[model samples]
Target chain A: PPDRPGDPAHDPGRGRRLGIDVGAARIGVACSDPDAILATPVETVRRDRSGKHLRRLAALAAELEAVEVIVGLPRTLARSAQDAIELAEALARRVSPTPVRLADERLTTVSAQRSLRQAGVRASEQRAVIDQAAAVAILQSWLDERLAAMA
Target chain B: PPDRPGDPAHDPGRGRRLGIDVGAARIGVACSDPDAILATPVETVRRDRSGKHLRRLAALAAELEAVEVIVGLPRTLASAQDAIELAEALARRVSPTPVRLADERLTTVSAQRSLRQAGVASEQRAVIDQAAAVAILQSWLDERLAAMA
Candidate 1:
């Protein structure tokens, strides 16, 4: 049944959403309210291929009771997806049947750098925060788009 | 020579500092003031096997005038140094290198999840923001530790 304006299905109660900004070197994570209004920077996970990374992610998901995982998908200027698409997909698959959404990450990196600069952050320090900022950007984009659709 | 209590080396001057928390799916970044106080949440970057990711990082380093980078090193309980030593070495090789330190990551995942739980608006939306919050926490931890020692 289609959910009414404020029905449970339409508004799945207030819970938390997890946003993931995937990178070769790090994994930037963020979370949003069940209302999906505000996205906050969480933590940066170091990159590893030993499946330990997955264990860590699963632990996080369980810990937070995350409903879904949002991963940033990178594409070329021409809108063509990059090869990492496979890896991202694989990551989603490995993680679980948990719903995973891919967001277009065209300028997240550039924007992150710019934001850091504007904040008077040193270049040396941007590395630590860039990923989380990107995650926020990704979640914010999603939230904004969803809100627009709702309106 | 060892840094004095109020020496520039020890003081960190007024320059900004950046920390990169590398992960399998994303890269969490945090920045600090030149005084090395107050680390703020930055952004997360999508993972790409291509070198483009590094190029983007280089551009950020240049823009921030970052003097050093602290990369979180993932190590197993059994082999703390062996698991993440290679990653630490690779992080240094990425360039713009002057000082690189590998921080032991223990509860970053749990911490991130807990932070998300504390901040999530809805339980059914997604988890990107949770990741970002974790990055913020990691940076805070780094800054606090640096100040203490």
Candidate 2:
């Protein structure tokens, strides 16, 4: 059959992997290639009452042809779950059909800040890239762990 | 008053603006000066099941001394009222203090693709930086709209 205009199978290699850091104020995003060897920051979606943010994420998914979504899951040091953790879980469930996975997000924020500082970025200009960098760290850690296990 | 850590009075001009693009798969980031001009991409963080992601963000915030965080609001033409509204709202509450608002995202993916098409250096390799560029564009648009209004 000829290719249809909006068929998912029309482009087999078009889909990519997604990594998300769901924060209180911002949503960090990181993406990976088909090989999953490298991950890059996408963007942070703002939180608003209009629900416009979710739609934007869906659209980005469509545009990137993403196959999977990885979300950051926050936890407590006591190994006990809290309300925020539950909220993250619920969000993951809501994003179903996109194949969502929860990655532990303990120190991603700190790592992001450190990476930026090391890059010589001024303190006054660190907010924008923090979330994305955190997402990348999460995804990269996951990818590395998976590869290490495979190795 | 002597300079003390976390003292707002002593650090009146220490705030920063961050522009972020939230995608299903990745998050792009850009930072602006206190004057709200000129943004640069920093780094791209990966998403996974470990709690290291949030820590990374916190670390960045601390290192950058960012006071306000600006995130790109994602929206669809249809059903904009529903779908992930709660999530975004919750995300706002969960985010750090002094977070501000920004316009919804529109052409981030396309813009990145175009950059790749234009043979930009480190185009695909630096997704975070590219996303930062998108944030910068959005910021410019918002500033223009504000001025026009």
Candidate 3:
């Protein structure tokens, strides 16, 4: 189920989109090209409560010239997760009028890490790259689904 | 969806069902009351995978008069899960009667986290493991009950 039910549908245009994996420690960033056909890791942002994360993110979004920003909604207890939702909403406000959307990321991390491990990334080495890889997975999934809807 | 064309539904009758948490050294056992309102650890079976485990388990099943057995489907890659196959083999060994697999994602990790919070000493390997066993089954029980809700 889509959490909070923001947008009903995504009609992907031939423009760049940024997919974000929000973590307590870091934000893994991935972006698609004009076609949104494939996503590649852009960078990882160290996070904080200082508003620094969003400031840097807005800068990065400007640098990338993204058409829209999609943030991964990590699943948690509904009551406890309001703070996170609020933060994302705050981010959306800070970066207006750039559209920000949330995607339900129920099992993306688990499946992402699994995909990496299967491809021969060692467990010891996975931590450094897994988050970015997850961002890649999230954007690719969204793009693929959106692209298919158009199909 | 109903690949059963009727993999349609699982109608768990109101009866006692045993959930086996198969750890390497000890098997943590949780049994639900007939109403399925409660699940509690009954006996912790020590595992040697010695076939004796099933013999002992079968006897326990008779003693409790359980209606069915469900085993934790240990997590692994889709292509490689020796433990899952072992559970299948075990279900058949218990009886061609039947065995059900409980989807076990992150069960071990959650169990370990709870054990840590409970302040169980890491050195008490057997006790810690046994407690973690209950931890997983209890977590599973909550998930099942919540979904029912």
Candidate 4:
């Protein structure tokens, strides 16, 4: 129970919040603690050549009982390339009820990648780490936005 | 004492073979042990804002007792400008010492749909600089000496 933070059976609120950093070929996803205070990287997903990716994402949300999905807004950082904007929007719907919130994501990628390199994780291995790391950045920013509005 | 392989000093033949990979700012050096058997990274010398780098590089060659410095030639394994001229100038500085050119190149930027996806950084440039000379010199040395045929 302690190893897996959000066990759907025990926590109905399991997938309550998540952050998404979409890429052309893969997606970086992060989950928020049920307490909604922090986000942590989970893993990277490859979607370049399949619809199975969308099905998997939808299933992930359903399994986690997630209703608040924060998708990084394209152009939130214009320099952050527009490659995945259209794709993310489609996945947001397929994983409905979960509904995606647009979150500004900028440099989370460069920051995640730099952190990985400085940590001495080699190039091939970092791919497995970057998405989730970027997801944490996106989710945290979304959380900050929510907190600021409440303030 | 007779010249033996792996001698860095005491062999009049010691270190006469040197290799250099010249970058925008530093010269990455590799030298062969006296018998011209192996090549190893020696040091990197910064050549910034001036041609005075020639003097410094000449001194490095002298200290190692080198007579032939193989300067990495950059044109598509590649240096494209002021650098190539700078290398030729170095040859004249330690003339009779003889500086020869060998190939050195960087690569295509396949920025991905493939990967970045470090799979890394810049200033990160310092690493391969040393390797380039080692590679170039190893190739040159193999061909030049050819186990004395």
Candidate 5:
């Protein structure tokens, strides 16, 4: 259809991708359509000590047939950098063969949250969806860069 | 002592107040000294659905002997209804110590930036809440001072 991108088969590189913003308390998830034109918030996964969230993310990737999984790296803070790196590495191991990439997420959370507030999301209820919004911001940033390169 | 306000014993009606920035997951608390000259971050209280946090705040007010409680009312594109509802509930719990709602626009982002500048990282989410509470309280104090001047 002219409304959407040309058929996914013709453009082999464009495929659905999953993005994650891993926090200590909650993890945000977002996914792009096969064409990678837009990213939408998926779900906020609660972190558990038994690593259940990690397995759940891997399952989600398989279920969605995600070609790639992008994990946001908070390189701006030393402590957060190591934490995100550790989570991303573990997630990569769990979702093996489904290439995982890390994108700089310096201020994605703050920006995502500001956007949510502007969109009239109540501050009290923002916690439930802020993580997912952050994931969307991270994935959208990556998609925008790729689209710009194609242009 | 010279830099700070004079003794509170002599300053009537200028008593300490508690300020709060309430969020879904946490409630940030800040407190002014008896002189009401500055607001300092106290602690972040974990929020629960059973109204435990509200009672906790009320207890804190009683323990601290606060004269007033200021609850931040978010003015960021959303109705202050949700925040004010919380304030009313808190007011009911902490009676005799009046609860005042103040605008808290950009306080969270500002607090986050301030925390980053102060070498606080993202891992300290609890501290972030405290910093936001401090911002809300400090702004309210400054506004009150300006109005008096």
Candidate 6:
């Protein structure tokens, strides 16, 4: 399974973890089950110039007592890579002691939209929770491979 | 050299080409020498929700008879990618028939101070965007040259 193309090899260790999808206007959050078997949507955090969003994420990590936070790394061209990296680095500082891992998030949103459509989620409704759904997708994929690695 | 990692193998083919650096507020434009050896800043086009900016680029490409238009694609996270890709597609919809999207890694502020010291601070933002467009084009030119070598 490790040899499978696009499959991440690194295991994120055990216990509950958080997955984050960083967007320009909003940030999606999801958390894994205690056993790391299922990932559920948490909240969609609004973004701002202030550090409020980062503070909220750090607060969530502390409240959930997450072991680690997995952030989706966008495979971007150049301009956007900076924003994501800056956010990821800033989040790392905020959630210190608890490590942050970056997972490749190539098409998480696209896949999320498809799944949501299949689930009868309307486009208007999806906008409010799309980020969260994408976060779920990001975390779920990470969890799936981690489970597969062990099996 | 072609086997070198991270190097793009395909040649962008030759002739005068337009290089554009799309930004949130403005679009910076630059063009290469007839031989594609050098890139020089042209102008900064203000951006709006309307298609005025795209029309202007297409007009410039047609006026210059550019063989291709090179767009500096920002390696962005999820959110901004849509914007960049949208601009790129819109440009294609307008003109230059052939448009090339090139990777843009990232710019400087000391250069800004230098420009201001030269007394062009009045048009500081405009000049900066043009300079950025030049860099974007020059980067692509250098890469292609290196690949050819």
The A-chain TM-scores of all the candidates are 0.70, 0.66, 0.77, 0.72, 0.79, 0.79
Q: Write the per-residue lDDT of candidate 1 for residues B1-149, one digit (tens) a residue.
A: 11122223433344655655555555666665555533454566555766455666566666778655555544445233532442354445545443344444432443443333443333222334334433433343334434444
Q: Candidate 4: which pairs clash?
A: A15-A66, B74-B79, B77-B104, B77-B105, B78-B104, B78-B105
Q: What DockQ does candidate 6 have relative to the true complex? A: 0.01
Model 2, position B25: C-alpha lDDT score: 39
Chain B of candidate 3 vs. true chain B, TM: 0.68
Give candidate 5 regions above 4 Å deviation.
A1-12, A76-79, A107-124, B1-149
TM-score against native, each model: 0.44, 0.40, 0.43, 0.40, 0.44, 0.43
Q: Rank the candidates by lDDT, best first.
A: 5, 6, 3, 4, 1, 2
Q: For residue B62, what is the lDDT in candidate 2?
A: 62
Please identify model 6 stretches exceeding 4 Å from their true place.
A1-12, A107-126, B1-149
DockQ of each: 0.03, 0.03, 0.01, 0.01, 0.02, 0.01
DockQ of 2: 0.03
lDDT of 1 by residue, A8-125 (tens): 3434434566777666666777777656655666777777767566666666666777666666766554312453354456666755756556765652342433233335443545
Provide i-RMS per model in Å. Answer: 9.0, 11.9, 23.2, 19.3, 17.4, 25.1
Per-residue lDDT tens digits of candidate 3, residues B1-149?
00010021553444666767666566666665565433445666767655677777777777777765666665565312544654676667666344566655634434342333343223333333333333344334344444443
Cα error, residue A10 of model 4, in Å, equals 27
Candidate 4 lDDT, B7-113, residue by residue in tens: 23322332458887666676767776565534556666777776677778888889988867776655543344555676678878887776666544311111110
**Candidate 2 lDDT, tens digit per residue, A1-151?**
1112112442233347677665555667778776554566678888566766666666666676666666655555432235335434555455556655556555234233333323543443445655665576566444433333333
Best by lDDT: 5
Error of 2 at B35 (Å): 12
Model 4: how far is B21 from its true place, Å? 44
**Interface RMSD computed for candidate 3 is what?**
23.2
Instruction: Report chain B TM per candidate.
Output: 0.58, 0.56, 0.68, 0.69, 0.79, 0.74
